[PDB]
Amino acid sequence: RDIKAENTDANFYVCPPPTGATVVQFEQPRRCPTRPEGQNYTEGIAVVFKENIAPYKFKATMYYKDVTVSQVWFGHRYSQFMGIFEDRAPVPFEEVIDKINAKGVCRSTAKYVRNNLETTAFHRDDHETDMELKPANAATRTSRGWHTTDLKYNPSRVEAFHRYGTTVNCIVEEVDARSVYPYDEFVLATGDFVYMSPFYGYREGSHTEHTSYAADRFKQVDGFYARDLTTKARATAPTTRNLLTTPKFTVAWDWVPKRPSVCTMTKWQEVDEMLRSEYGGSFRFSSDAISTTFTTNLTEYPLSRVDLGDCIGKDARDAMDRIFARRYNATHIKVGQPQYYLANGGFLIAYQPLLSNTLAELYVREHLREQSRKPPNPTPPASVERIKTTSSIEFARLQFTYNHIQRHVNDMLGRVAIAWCELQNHELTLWNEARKLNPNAIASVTVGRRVSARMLGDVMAVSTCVPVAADNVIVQNSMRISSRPGACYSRPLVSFRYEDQGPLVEGQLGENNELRLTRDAIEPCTVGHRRYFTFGGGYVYFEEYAYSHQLSRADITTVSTFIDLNITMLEDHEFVPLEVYTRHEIKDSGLLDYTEVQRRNQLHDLRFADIDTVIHADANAAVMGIVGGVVSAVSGVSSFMSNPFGALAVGLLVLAGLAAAFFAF
Amino acid sequence: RDIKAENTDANFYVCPPPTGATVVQFEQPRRCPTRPEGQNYTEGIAVVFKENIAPYKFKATMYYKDVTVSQVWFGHRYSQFMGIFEDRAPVPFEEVIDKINAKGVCRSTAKYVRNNLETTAFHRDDHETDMELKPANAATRTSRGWHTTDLKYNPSRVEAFHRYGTTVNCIVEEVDARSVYPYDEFVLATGDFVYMSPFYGYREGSHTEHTSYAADRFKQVDGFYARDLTTKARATAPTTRNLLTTPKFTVAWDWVPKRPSVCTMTKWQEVDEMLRSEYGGSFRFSSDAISTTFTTNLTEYPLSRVDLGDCIGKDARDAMDRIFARRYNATHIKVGQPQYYLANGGFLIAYQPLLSNTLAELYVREHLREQSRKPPNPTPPASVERIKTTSSIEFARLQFTYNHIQRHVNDMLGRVAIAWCELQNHELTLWNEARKLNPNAIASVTVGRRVSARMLGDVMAVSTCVPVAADNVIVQNSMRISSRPGACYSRPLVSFRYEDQGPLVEGQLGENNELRLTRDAIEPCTVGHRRYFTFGGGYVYFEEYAYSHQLSRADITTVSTFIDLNITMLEDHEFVPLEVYTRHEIKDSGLLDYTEVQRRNQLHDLRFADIDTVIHADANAAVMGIVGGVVSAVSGVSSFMSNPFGALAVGLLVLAGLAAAFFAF
Amino acid sequence: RDIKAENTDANFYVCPPPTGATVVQFEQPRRCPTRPEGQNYTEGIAVVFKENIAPYKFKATMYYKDVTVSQVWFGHRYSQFMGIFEDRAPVPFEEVIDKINAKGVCRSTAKYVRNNLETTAFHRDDHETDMELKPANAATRTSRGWHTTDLKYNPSRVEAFHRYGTTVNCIVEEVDARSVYPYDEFVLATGDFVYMSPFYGYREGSHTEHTSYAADRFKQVDGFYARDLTTKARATAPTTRNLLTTPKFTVAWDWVPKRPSVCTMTKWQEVDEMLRSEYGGSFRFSSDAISTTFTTNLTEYPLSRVDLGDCIGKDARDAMDRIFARRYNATHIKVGQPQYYLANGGFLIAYQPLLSNTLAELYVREHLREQSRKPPNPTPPASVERIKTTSSIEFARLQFTYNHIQRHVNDMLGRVAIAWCELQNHELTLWNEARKLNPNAIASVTVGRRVSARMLGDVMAVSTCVPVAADNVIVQNSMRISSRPGACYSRPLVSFRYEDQGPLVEGQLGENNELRLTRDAIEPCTVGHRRYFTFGGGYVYFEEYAYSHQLSRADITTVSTFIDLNITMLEDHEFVPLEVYTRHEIKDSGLLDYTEVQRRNQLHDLRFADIDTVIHADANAAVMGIVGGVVSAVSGVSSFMSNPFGALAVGLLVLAGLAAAFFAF
Numbered sequence A, B, C: 001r002d003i004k005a006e007n008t009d010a011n012f013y014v015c016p017p018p019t020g021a022t023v024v025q026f027e028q029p030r031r032c033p034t035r036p037e038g039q040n041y042t043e044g045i046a047v048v049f050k051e052n053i054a055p056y057k058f059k060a061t062m063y064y065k066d067v068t069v070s071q072v073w074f075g076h077r078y079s080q081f082m083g084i085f086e087d088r089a090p091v092p093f094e095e096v097i098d099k100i101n102a103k104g105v106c107r108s109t110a111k112y113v114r115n116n117l118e119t120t121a122f123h124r125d126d127h128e129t130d131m132e133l134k135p136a137n138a139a140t141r142t143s144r145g146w147h148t149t150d151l152k153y154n155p156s157r158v159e160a161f162h163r164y165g166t167t168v169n170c171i172v173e174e175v176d177a178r179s180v181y182p183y184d185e186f187v188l189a190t191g192d193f194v195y196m197s198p199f200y201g202y203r204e205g206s207h208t209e210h211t212s213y214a215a216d217r218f219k220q221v222d223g224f225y226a227r228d229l230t231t232k233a234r235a236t237a238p239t240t241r242n243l244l245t246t247p248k249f250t251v252a253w254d255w256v257p258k259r260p261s262v263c264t265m266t267k268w269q270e271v272d273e274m275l276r277s278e279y280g281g282s283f284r285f286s287s288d289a290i291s292t293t294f295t296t297n298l299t300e301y302p303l304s305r306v307d308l309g310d311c312i313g314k315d316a317r318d319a320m321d322r323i324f325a326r327r328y329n330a331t332h333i334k335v336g337q338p339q340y341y342l343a344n345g346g347f348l349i350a351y352q353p354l355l356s357n358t359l360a361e362l363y364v365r366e367h368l369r370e371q372s373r374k375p376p377n378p379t380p381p382a383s384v385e386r387i388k389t390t391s392s393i394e395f396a397r398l399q400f401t402y403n404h405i406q407r408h409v410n411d412m413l414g415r416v417a418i419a420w421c422e423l424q425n426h427e428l429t430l431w432n433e434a435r436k437l438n439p440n441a442i443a444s445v446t447v448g449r450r451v452s453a454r455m456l457g458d459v460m461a462v463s464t465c466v467p468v469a470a471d472n473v474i475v476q477n478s479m480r481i482s483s484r485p486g487a488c489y490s491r492p493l494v495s496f497r498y499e500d501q502g503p504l505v506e507g508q509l510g511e512n513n514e515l516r517l518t519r520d521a522i523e524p525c526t527v528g529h530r531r532y533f534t535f536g537g538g539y540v541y542f543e544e545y546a547y548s549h550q551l552s553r554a555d556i557t558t559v560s561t562f563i564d565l566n567i568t569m570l571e572d573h574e575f576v577p578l579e580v581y582t583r584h585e586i587k588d589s590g591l592l593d594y595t596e597v598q599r600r601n602q603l604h605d606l607r608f609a610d611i612d613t614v615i616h617a618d619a620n621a622a623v624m625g626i627v628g629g630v631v632s633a634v635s636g637v638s639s640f641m642s643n644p645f646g647a648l649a650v651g652l653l654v655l656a657g658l659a660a661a662f663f664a665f
């Protein structure tokens, strides 16, 4: 009667009833945490402003007179230029107002200040004539220009002799004008600047504006009237005019005020769904529409400290009105006056709170509390400042996304934390009637190690089991009683030994390999007896209360009490760099890098022309030498006579030679 | 016999058997939701194009003649310049083709149009001589230049008298040329522009191209041949040549066609793993390689409407061929003709679908369905357009990431939602045999409040329990029967009262503080009786069926049926701004801000030179006064004689004085 | 006695006891996975450097002499300029060192090289006089300038005759100077360049630096001394000076060494909380402070290969010292020497590891292992290189965020995976005593289909049930026995039929619609008998062991064993594009696009002036014709006499006429 387990994988445990010595208890439903109240989002409309870098850009009209006078020396079949003087000349005030404005013409004469002198240039070197302004030729992507002279003047051919030819052209050319903050100078598309502020005048203290030019160069015309140079129909509108002359030209333009025309800020974006939140001592402005969150201090930014920010109010007012009348007008209602929070990163924010008609009951609170939010801090003390604005926007996209992801994931994580907690709490009843049914199993699964257990009233008493090797356990074949039939064992018989040499000890195989000491599990004998029992890592099958054979585990088809669960972590992912256009594509997109251009235009020498070489040439170095010295004495004499006083005594002499000789004849 | 609970923390409940009045039932497995089919990703290869800002850049050759003529007036030991005329002159067509091209030389004479005149300048004021072109000096980061004259001319020294010195230099200089869309003008690295289109000619209707210049200035050479200026070996290739002259210079270049040379778009990126998805009426192109998703309308963009986008087809074809032959060629197969979807944000997309040999069975469908996707919308109506391309790329990284995060998190969230649902469904069996075992506990945990319960067939009947204070409950000491020994109580005896003054009412302490009314839980008396019982917030221990003492809870070692769960939400995180380089670092990286440069070069006056001061000086202001008036009359007379007709009568007079005097002698 | 189910929704199953044929088993606790060790983050301090685009910017002083000489021709009431020569002249070395430096004055004479000639210009055409340098007028946002002449010279009025007027102005103007890598040329704010390296000299082999200029133009002053031009107090410091002259001007500056002055890199950011991680064969540098992660190869970048990166060491050293003394000095301690990892994307990284005093035990290891990390790869072979740095930073923000999100979400996902696994394992005990209580239910829920079950020892035997339609099942009214009272059925009686025509078969309704064949569930008769039973999709209520009536399900109030679970997936979200400022706002912010400016300044012709028109004019074309031909012969003769040799014979003749006539008188 010698039988051992097929698989010694799982050791047998002999586990006796315990004493009241050791005794343990279960936990109880730890009061589970609760949800958060959630961040209160105040709906509103936003409009965000940015530092202006786009220069102030306007229109003006230029008036000038190109004065080009040339030497020409002649040969037998040929004429060469000996020098071309080429100048830009201002047109006087009166000649613009009278000859150019009213009559659309211009003097053929120039009279202007250059190089500490007055000059007067005759066109053709001929008598002054009022000449006509005719439209400039067809020109592409340019302004509309005008001129009098379409071709310059040059003297008639006198064989081998120097002539001078004067030419004057009265040109009018309307142009654009650009200006950068603080707007004290302005440029012309001709590359010429004007060193005067574009808003100077006589009206509302306009003498305050800085101009280096003396007051007389520029005059302002109150209630001025303009007439087109081609159409020549007077403009219906009366425009206050301004006219400033330079040593090269004279420009005129229409005058407008300052603050309702320029602004350090500029309107950047319009958000109809901007959500304000208050957290950790700051506001976050989440446009769900454009995926954006903004960080602002609690107090509104004081607009007064905004410099020249009169664009702000007007712009924000118009935009917000249009949006609210469009899409919010019958669903919510306005709450308080608009707010100008300062957006971390240099983005000026206009934000309008608003509440639904659904819960207008609350408006009193909200209104008061919105009014609390602008400080009157500038009032008790004027020093002004600009707003420094960045050029990248990514903190807001990333910050929004991380808060929306963060919102969802932490939200769900919380919900499932609660659900798990209350599930484990809910189980203890199942574990409680279950622990009542079979104490040994539940106590072993609970404490962690295999132990005995018995109910000691409303508590559980335990004591550690005893390990027993499989090669030291015997199965006896029979399950019936030879002495008393009709009442036979319900579970097989085992003869284990606690030590490989230890005495053989009989017992009754119990559930889950517990080699119970007492042989007391008897049932009445019954027909059709098929029983699979637990033994070692496998099973042991008896038919009709008698040892059939031992089986491995997978011999029997297998089902499960388990609900599958399949999680895959998010694999890593590298983020490669990327620029849309590189900065060298931009320095290259600049059709001319002025730097490169001048760098070339100034090597116009050392490449193919030497400046480190000096030449002295003498015609007389090039009895006969003595005679040549004689003409030099004459040559040096003529030098004394090349100039005024020596020259005067000679003209007086020349008068004599011809005079005296003839009167005698 | 007066005993009360150690801890009154938990009130006792007396809970009687119920009536059939109140009766409740359990829920049943709510059919759990199911997974989504998942978005079908169509593998393919992509190539994305962008607006061209890099100007069209090519090579050309300049030819000109610097004409510099100078006055020099002399003193005793010294010579001063009185004026330096300095001009740039064009080289005629023939002198380039004949003297410069074939012979590599150039005339020492200039003959060119300037200021409505023809001029002819002699080098040295000496007879025309064909002169040699020698290489320019060593120059760094420049082109390769050439010249004839390496040093200018100046007259010999004549004491106190004005001389003129002419100099002509024939210079050749090959340069780069840049051009911006629409490419009607092009620049030179010398800063000089040429107001003609770079593709003008006589071939395939090239008279269409706009040029303001008259046809005669520029000539095209069919089948032209070039020879190096230093190497002077003829180029093997025959190049159609173009030659345009300006009033300052003359440039020549090789001619090429238009559309196979320029393109409003430019190839930006090559993606071998671009995944197309269709969702919500749009396509999303997720390059897993570069972390990108693209949004496109359903229909392909019509390439024909792309302006000058003949670069597109060629480029995309070559690239996609190279990739597919490289890495996809034996695993997938091509599906349909390539596609040009328009990428929201202005990114033109070339996308090639493709399917695996694994499932080529489907190709018919896919092919047809891919062919359905380009519309023939331009055919029934030519108006063209450019593609406006942005300069930031972040919508795609953020949109990809949010879709991949979103994919993973919502995927796992769904899986666990299902698993929980079917777990709660799976539990009801446990709760069902468990609810059978001890109705009171399961009904109390279920309904939420402590109630009684008994099985009413296949359902459960309930009735609310009764609260009972602890200071109103007594434990009687004994647990055995004085009258009938051998059969003694299994649970202690209590004498509670429902009201602090209410009558004392006897009962038998039950499980979990239920003060059962009927005293009927009896077991046979047994040795070794140790029992911990539940009483109040604590326990009450009896030995041998007799009151020992009451204990607190933590007196007993504690185990648990709970599986720990530890979740931490994702802490907030602020995102600080950051620019790599600021825009002022770029306006500063521009080695010259042309704006700043001219702004300085035009204050070259008011800082250290006054223009508002005019000087009139008279030599005669500087009996003797009467004699001085006499020379003025002579001075003004000489003025009449300074000019032609007065001067003629004088030369005729001068002829007489010397003539008449001598013939008589 | 004819009764059928109210709702045929749920089919009845007749399910008999099984045979030992079919038999199944449960799963066992699959050993659950375990947590990861987590990535070891090495704390440290970082400083990251970037390619320098900000040019090297310094100060210098310019010295020059504007030489302006003018023709003026006069009329009766008027004077016109005939040509204004205007030049920039260098001031010689000695005149700067002696006249300008020591004495703060300057010569009124210019003597300089231009156009291969020496020239000497007299101011006023008057004797040389040392003149004073007086401060320039008030000028805004300019440097401080100086000059001698504040107003130019012009000749006195001689009626109808050409005069020349010379003017020289000695101007000093200190300016800024800019320079781009490789720093061989440098610009001036005047737009003029200087084609020499800014670090050339005589000290420590400074003859190596490239200059095209000959050595004589520029001289270096060892131990130079400067004195302010207004304050005129000598500077205390002795500065080595450098003086280079150009053909137009002469500039001077103080000399400094090279490598401790310029650097291809530049300090970009300072991170006190930079966390290094090692993973997948690379390092990731996560500044938690600025939301950043960096990717680097294992080996440090060899600084020696950094070109001119002597700024690097000094800068990183100072910064890291300041931070560590500030905030880390008593909590951690330094580990090893600093490290220069090369940041993927072109960002040079200085990184200092450090460990806490908490666990300094480990330092030996860490130190050694940190020292292992810089390679000595450059030593066995000098070739140098720059570092190419990008202009966008987003890979780091997105990569950091995706790793922090990824960290949290995968972390929690893992924890809950484990918890679920061990929960399902923990349940099997509940399912095991529960499976013991009622085999049919647990086997049916387990296998998936309704089956029979009975305990076959330590295993379970099953056999499939039989479906039975509801319209084929009868409820008999009574529940008591007519023959034997006092002992009556516990569950109602049914007469089903397996086929719509099949014979009627009696049985006893069991739990959950099992139509048990054997009628053997009897209890003793009892008062107050109310029983709800399960029947069809509904219930069937008997009072006092007799058919009352059948009810629907919702007739009874309903409770639940289920813990609610509410998950919402993250809704999709589109990310719209966005630029802060567009590139056209930048080309527009450039107050002058030099490209646009010159493009306008070169159409100063074709719009309003025709160059394609040539004029030939003849005064003589404008008996009398014969007499006019006579003056032309004289006119052409005077041409022969307009020049030297013909002119000499005439002056000799003129000498005779007056001479001979008078001596005879």
Ligand SMILES: *[C@@H]1O[C@H](CO)[C@@H](O[C@@H]2O[C@H](CO)[C@@H](O)[C@H](O)[C@H]2NC(C)=O)[C@H](O)[C@H]1NC(C)=O
Pocket: B566, B567, B568
């Ligand atoms: C539950 O998990 C959290 C997060 O891992 C543990 O909190 C950390 O505990 C130690 C000591 O405080 C440190 O790793 C961190 O400082 C803690 N994280 C914090 C404060 O965010 C926590 O100990 C865990 N609880 C357990 C396992 O019972």
Ligand SMILES: *[C@@H]1O[C@H](CO)[C@@H](O)[C@H](O)[C@H]1NC(C)=O
Pocket: A037, A038, A039, A040
């Ligand atoms: C949000 O408002 C509600 C009541 O309006 C209240 O829970 C609390 O004041 C706010 N919750 C926060 C700030 O978490």
